[PDB]
């Protein structure tokens, strides 16, 4: 329990936009590199509370590319992919953004 009772209390921050972009950076190589360098798009649009949410974009993006039968990831594949991951969050944020007091 108590601070320093087992030594070293280290809080891990939720990642910044610059951090989200770097987490994204590495998965892009592993995937097929985007056409038009639209890496900054994803990072601006939302920032997560987890390195997991970032990762969630990569996988989501490859559902759409797969279907289109185009390997290479694109801005359009990205726009669909950030919209899918942000859906989960917008819906719980409209109920305190609207119809509140």
């Amino acid at each position: 329990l108590r601070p320093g009772r087992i030594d070293r209390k280290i809080e891990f921050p939720p990642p910044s936009v610059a951090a989200r972009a770097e987490i994204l950076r590495i998965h892009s190589r592993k995937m097929n590199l985007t056409r038009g360098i639209n890496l900054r798009k994803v990072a601006e649009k939302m920032n997560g509370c987890s390195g997991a949410d970032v990762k969630g974009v990569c996988t989501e993006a490859g559902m759409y590319a797969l279907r289109e039968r185009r390997i290479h990831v694109t801005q359009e594949d990205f726009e669909l992919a950030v919209g899918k991951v942000m859906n989960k969050n917008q819906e719980t944020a409209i109920s305190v953004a609207k119809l509140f007091k």
Binding site: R67, E68, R69, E76, L80
Partner: protein
């Protein structure tokens, strides 16, 4: 005559930027592409659809720009590839996540 109907869109569209708004000018673009689809020249039709697809991807929320994606499907259909027709059906579907887009569009 196909020729004259096409000509009336050409006069209007030039006029659509120095007496009128952009909104009209991109509508008449679909109209041109629609009648070239009737004339049976596909190079022309596709080429207009690409100009709309790209520039007004930024300005996509319009019921008018759903129709772009549909027409694109109708052109890839007649080119006999149903991979990119399907793909551009799927694009139309995203831009009409809404069922509150004009009814004619929905029927199409």
């Amino acid at each position: 005559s196909l020729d004259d109907q096409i000509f009336v869109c050409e006069k209007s569209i030039e006029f659509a930027k120095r007496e009128k708004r952009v909104f009209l000018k991109h509508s008449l673009s679909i109209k041109l592409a629609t009648l070239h689809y009737q004339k049976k020249q596909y190079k022309d039709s596709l080429a207009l659809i690409n100009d709309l697809l790209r520039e007004f991807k930024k300005l996509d929320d319009k019921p008018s720009l759903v129709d772009v994606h549909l027409l694109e499907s109708k052109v890839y259909h007649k080119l006999r590839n149903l991979a990119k027709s399907k793909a551009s059906l799927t694009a139309a579907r995203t831009a009409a996540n809404s069922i509150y887009c004009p009814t004619q569009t929905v029927a199409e």
